[PDB]
Amino acid sequence: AKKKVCYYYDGDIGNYYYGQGHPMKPHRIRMTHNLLLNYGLYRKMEIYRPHKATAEEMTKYHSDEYIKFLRSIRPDNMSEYSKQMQRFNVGEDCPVFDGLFEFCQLSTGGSVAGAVKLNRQQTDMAVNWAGGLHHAKKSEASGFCYVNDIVLAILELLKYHQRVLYIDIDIHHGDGVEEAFYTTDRVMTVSFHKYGEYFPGTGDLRDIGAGKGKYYAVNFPMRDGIDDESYGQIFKPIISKVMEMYQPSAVVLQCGADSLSGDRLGCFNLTVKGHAKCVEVVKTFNLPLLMLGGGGYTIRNVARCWTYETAVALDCEIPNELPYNDYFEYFGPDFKLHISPSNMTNQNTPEYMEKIKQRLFENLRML
């Protein structure tokens, strides 16, 4: 039926700034929030402000040294930490900015808080659009991500769930999450991503897990230009089979929006409806569900996508005509919720889509 939804947001989020020209704009989370509030969606869900996750919380996965560094590093003391910066991959893609650690605390706090809420059976779904930082590693920043809120949330869920399923529709491979759980069967990770001379360079379909986790990592490598139809042909069959074989008791869905048509950094051709179809599919399994954000660099479309996916989680139909909001000018020239795909070529033939699906199905028979 209709599900109870708890939603995590801290209004301070939009004030963090990666620096001039950096494509990651935390402000997109405020835009998303402002938009969904103007559609009246606050009426249907509980809105929480997450706590700032502590170093204790973060060191449930990350090394004490990496976290102490993140707590210490500031733009005013960078010159002293030059070695440590290189060791932990900070100062380029992953810059030092004012309030960096607090920004990690806020985005992490939402995922961990949502996981606790699900564990206590006090919601059916928890939403943290500030989370989904899938590239962060035990002792290293990567791809704009510093602290892996997702691995932390999953570790929380594993306190009460024998098997947790992770699904990642970000255009990039979820390497940090896959890496953390690569050798366990208690977390199956499923990533659909662009593959071939593309960040982070991992997620070959032959990467299937190791030891006890062998066959519990599933990767669907894709080419430029994938569209709603190609994606839809593959997503539901794969997830259904995964659900059948794996029988998870909780699910974490990363909804990274850099897989949308027109993304500044991505090269997929999905609409908001195509992207959201993935949320609908996962929803129908009626399992405790943590939905997280992720990448997304054309910020008007990120706001539309996550607003609509919040509406999907709520089974709440919203008009295509955008309500007035604080960021109304970002949504021109159309001022509509939904987007059109571009005319870019889909390098993913139907045959390629079916062949990869078939290989993945063979692996799933091994469960």
The torsion angle over the Cα atoms of residues 10, 62, 156 and 107, rounded to 10 degrees, is: 10
Verify binding: residue 346, Ca ion, rule CB under 5 A.
Answer: no
Which residues between 22 and 61 bind ligand LLX (CB under 6 A)?
24
Q: Does 275 bind Zn ion (CB under 5 A)?
A: no
The structure tokens listed for 218 are 């599933």
- Decide if residue 194 touches Zn ion (CB under 5 A): no
Instruction: Report DSSP letters for 246-306, one per residue.
Output: H--SEEEEE--GGGBTT-SS---BB-HHHHHHHHHHHHTT---EEEE-----SHHHHHHHH
Gap between the Cα atoms of 3 and 45, Å rounded: 10
269: its two tokens: 């051709």
Q: Smallest distance from the beta carbon of 172 to Zn ion, in angstroms?
A: 4
DSSP letter, residue 337: S
Omega of the bond prior to 319 within 30 degrees of 0, cis? no
Q: State which of positions 124-143 bind ligand LLX (CB under 6 A).
A: 132-135, 143
Report the residue number, 135 or 304, with the smaller CB distance to ligand LLX: 135
CB of 80 to ligand LLX, least distance (A): 25
Q: Does 170 bind Zn ion (CB under 5 A)?
A: yes
Hey, which residues does 290 pair with through a beta bridge? Answer: 126, 252
Helix, strand counts (H, E) of the chain: 11, 8
CA gap 312, 170 in Å, rounded: 18
Total chain residues near Ca ion (CB under 5 A):
4
- In the list 256, 274, 288, 293, the residue contacting Zn ion (rule: CB under 5 A) is 256
Asked whether position 144 contacts ligand LLX by CB under 6 A, the answer is: yes
Q: From the centroid of its chain, how far is CA 54?
A: 21
Closer residue to Zn ion in complex, CB, 95/256: 256
109 binds ligand LLX (CB under 6 A): no
Backbone dihedral region of 89: left (phi > 0), alpha (psi from -120 to 50 degrees) or beta?
left
Residue 181 makes contact with Na ion by CB under 5 A: yes
| Least distance in angstroms from the C-beta of 274 to Zn ion | 17
Nearest-angstrom CA–CA distance, 5 and 129: 13
The site partner of 145 among Na ion, Zn ion, ligand LLX, none (C-beta below 5 to 8 Å per kind) is ligand LLX
Question: Is 192 assigned a ligand-binding role in the annotation?
Answer: yes
DSSP secondary structure code for residue 321 in this structure = B
Q: Which is nearer to ligand LLX, 134 or 161 (CB)?
A: 134
Please list every residue from 196 through 255 that binds Na ion, using CB under 5 A: 213, 216
Per DSSP (E only), the strands in the chain are 5-8, 46-48, 125-128, 164-168, 187-194, 217-222, 250-254, 289-292
- Phi and psi at 179, nearest 5°, equal -55, -50
Q: Is 359 annotated as a binding residue?
A: no
Which CB atom, from 124 or from 258, has the smaller least distance to Zn ion? 258
- Find where tokens 């089974």 sit: 315
Binders in 256-285 for ligand LLX, by CB under 6 A:
256, 258, 265
From 41, 118, 152, 187, residue interacting with Na ion (rule: CB under 5 A): 187
Identify whether 135 is a catalytic site residue: yes
How far apart CA 79 and CA 245 sit, in angstroms, is: 52
In the complex, minimum distance from the CB of residue 166 to Na ion, in angstroms, rounded to a whole number: 8
315 annotated as belonging to a binding site for a ligand: no
Q: Residue 145's closest CA among 175, 167, 110, 115? A: 175
Q: Which of 179, 258, 263, 309 binds Zn ion (CB under 5 A)?
A: 258
To the question of whether residue 258 is assigned a binding role by annotation, the answer is yes
Token pair recorded at residue 230: 């190609």
Question: Which of Na ion, ligand LLX, Ca ion, none is residue 15 near (CB under 5 to 8 Å by kind)?
Answer: none
Catalytic residue, chosen from 135, 161, 173, 275, is: 135
168 is in an annotated binding site: yes
Binding site for ligand LLX (CB under 6 A): 24, 107, 132-135, 143-145, 170, 172, 199, 256, 258, 265, 294-295
Where is the binding site for Zn(2+), in residues?
170, 172, 258
Where is the binding site, in residues?
21, 25, 168, 170, 172, 181, 184, 187, 191-192, 216, 258, 264
Binding site for Ca ion (CB under 5 A): 168, 170, 191, 193
Residues with active-site annotation: 135
